[PDB]
């Protein structure tokens, strides 16, 4: 049996750690909601 606990407000924060890249990927989505890499 699952329960929920508050964790924070939803706010844009200035000078958050900036990171990750921006990859453009060819993907397929099956009927089970699973993404896959087309190649």
């Amino acid at each position: 049996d699952m329960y929920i606990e508050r964790a924070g407000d939803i706010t844009w924060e200035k000078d958050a750690e900036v990171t990750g890249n921006s990859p453009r990927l060819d993907v397929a989505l099956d009927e089970s909601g699973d993404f896959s890499l087309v190649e």
Binding site: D1, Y3, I4, E17, S22
Partner: protein
């Protein structure tokens, strides 16, 4: 139960100790998460009970107490923020410029940030603080690193 707007952890005790299985957003009295987190199961907020209202396994989304409320969209240009809520750790904004999922049915925003599976449901924001979708349905690329869709539902 607590119905204050904001972000929440999704916990279970059915396992060893208390385990964070995911995350969600409360807005306009509706709770928003990903289907693979709850599998459409009822939830508890203190003593209050939340019942599923809408859900789609293929979108991998589910709403509780009412219809899907979040309708903001990535503009296709700007940096965004993942409000990561990882298991056992405090909420944390990470700023990123999303990449792209190209599919036969159109293009989706994607964020290249690897966090634990229990972070599934953490919201992605624009600079106005509006939620443009949820983190945690994605793919493992050649390297071995994880990339998530920006998953957004329809508001009716």
């Amino acid at each position: 139960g607590e119905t204050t707007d904001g972000v929440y952890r999704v916990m279970t005790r059915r396992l060893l100790g208390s385990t964070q299985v995911g995350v969600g957003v409360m807005q306009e009295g509706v709770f928003h998460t990903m289907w693979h987190v709850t599998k459409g199961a009822a939830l508890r907020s203190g003593e209050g009970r939340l019942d599923p209202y809408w859900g789609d396994v293929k979108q991998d989304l589910v709403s509780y107490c009412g219809p899907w409320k979040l309708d903001a969209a990535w503009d296709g240009l700007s940096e965004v923020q993942l409000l990561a809520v990882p298991p056992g750790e405090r909420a944390k904004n990470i700023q990123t410029l999303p990449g792209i999922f190209k599919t036969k049915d159109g293009d989706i925003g994607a964020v290249a940030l690897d966090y634990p599976a229990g972070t599934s449901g953490s919201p992605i924001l624009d600079k106005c603080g509006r939620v443009i979708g949820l983190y945690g349905n994605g793919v493992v690329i050649k390297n071995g690193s994880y990339v998530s869709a920006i998953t957004q539902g329809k508001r009716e």
